[PDB]
């Protein structure tokens, strides 16, 4: 009946939603297309993000943007109608964080944790662990205010499970962003030993190795990452751009310790990344860094930094403000400094350097 199938679907816990019996979903949707959970599952299957292939099953039975109108509309309708469904909340949260929707997913993750607490008070931890991972990722990405809470959650997850590499890589990310690499090398080496196949895992391992000590195979580590992508999605494109930027960065880092082949190679890699991305601000930032430091050119570095700052950035803003202030042109320098201050994306570097406030004050004085 409808009730039995609904209860079975709600109680059938999946380690990953992609392993669900897709022909069973087809059968249930054919039987009861009106069920909100049924249409949510149908939208999940129809989404390009899932591992399912609806066309093959039925036969057997460039712009920037990722979300789908039909899926968003159906999920919004279902969440407005039901207000209580573990599977619906899980699917909605998964779609949120996969569509790079962290802030919008916070109330829904809160509702899901409330529902899981309801179920606990009324006890498979397979769904609770997934929801905790989702909340920890939301804390890590959206918020340096909730970083410590996410780190504590990762520590608890690793202590209680010690079987998920996602928590390990999240803790590695938190350690990397806080310049705490000593544990990062150990964690990345352990993960790579567990499975030396994840391209991103090899990317972070080579990154951490290159940042101190070993630089020989650090460059070659990303080679198997860049060569093995063969991707066409927006996520694939930006991942390739990120890998190219990482290889260029570690490459000039190794070049730090007359020779110009290294600079030329990094220039070529960054040019390729900018060509394949056309909005990749770190590429312009690194190009401006190279132009200012090594090639000793003025206009090219200024243009690269201007593009990087317009797209995004302390160093680019400082370079442009110094270029304006030396002309002098205090209105444009005031505009750049005021934009940097109001952005609130560089408040950490503004607690030690006081040139933006001085620039704004001087421009008012003039």
């Amino acid at each position: 009946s409808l009730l039995a199938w609904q209860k079975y679907f709600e109680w059938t816990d999946y380690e990953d939603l992609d392993n669900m019996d897709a022909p069973l979903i087809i059968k249930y949707f054919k039987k009861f297309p009106k069920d909100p959970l049924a249409m949510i599952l149908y939208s999940w299957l129809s989404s390009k993000l899932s591992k399912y292939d609806i066309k093959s099953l039925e036969s057997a039975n460039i712009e920037i943007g990722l979300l789908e109108e039909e899926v968003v509309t159906v999920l919004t309708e279902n969440i407005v109608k039901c207000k209580n469904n573990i599977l619906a909340h899980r699917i909605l949260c998964q779609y949120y964080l996969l569509t790079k929707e962290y802030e919008a997913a916070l109330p829904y993750i809160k509702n899901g944790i409330s529902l899981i607490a309801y179920n606990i008070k009324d006890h498979l931890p397979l769904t609770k662990r997934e929801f905790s991972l989702d909340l920890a990722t939301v804390y890590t990405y959206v918020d340096p205010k909730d970083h410590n809470a996410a780190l504590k959650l990762y520590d608890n997850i690793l202590s209680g499970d010690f079987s998920n590499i996602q928590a390990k890589m999240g803790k590695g990310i938190i350690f990397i962003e806080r310049k705490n690499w000593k544990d990062a090398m150990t964690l990345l080496t352990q993960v790579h030993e567990q499975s030396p196949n994840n391209l991103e895992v090899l990317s972070e391992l080579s990154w951490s190795k290159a940042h101190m000590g070993y630089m020989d195979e650090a460059l070659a580590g990303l080679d198997t990452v860049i060569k093995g992508i063969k991707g066409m999605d927006l996520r694939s494109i930006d991942f390739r751009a990120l890998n190219l930027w990482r290889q260029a960065k570690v490459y000039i880092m190794k070049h730090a310790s007359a020779k110009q082949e290294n600079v030329k190679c990094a220039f070529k890699l960054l040019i390729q990344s900018i060509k394949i991305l056309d909005t990749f601000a770190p590429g312009f930032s690194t190009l401006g860094d190279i132009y200012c430091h090594y090639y000793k050119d003025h206009l090219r570095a200024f243009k690269c930094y201007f593009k990087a700052f317009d797209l995004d950035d302390y160093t680019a803003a400082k370079y442009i403000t110094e270029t304006y202030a030396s002309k002098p042109n205090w209105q444009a320098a005031s505009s750049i400094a005021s934009r940097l201050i109001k952005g609130e994306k560089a408040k950490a570097e503004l607690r030690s350097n006081n040139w933006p406030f001085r620039v704004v004050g001087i421009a008012h004085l003039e």
Partner: peptide
């Protein structure tokens, strides 16, 4: 150079 040319062709 080819590099500078490509850079100029990608921007203003």
């Amino acid at each position: 150079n080819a590099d500078d040319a490509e850079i100029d062709e990608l921007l203003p």
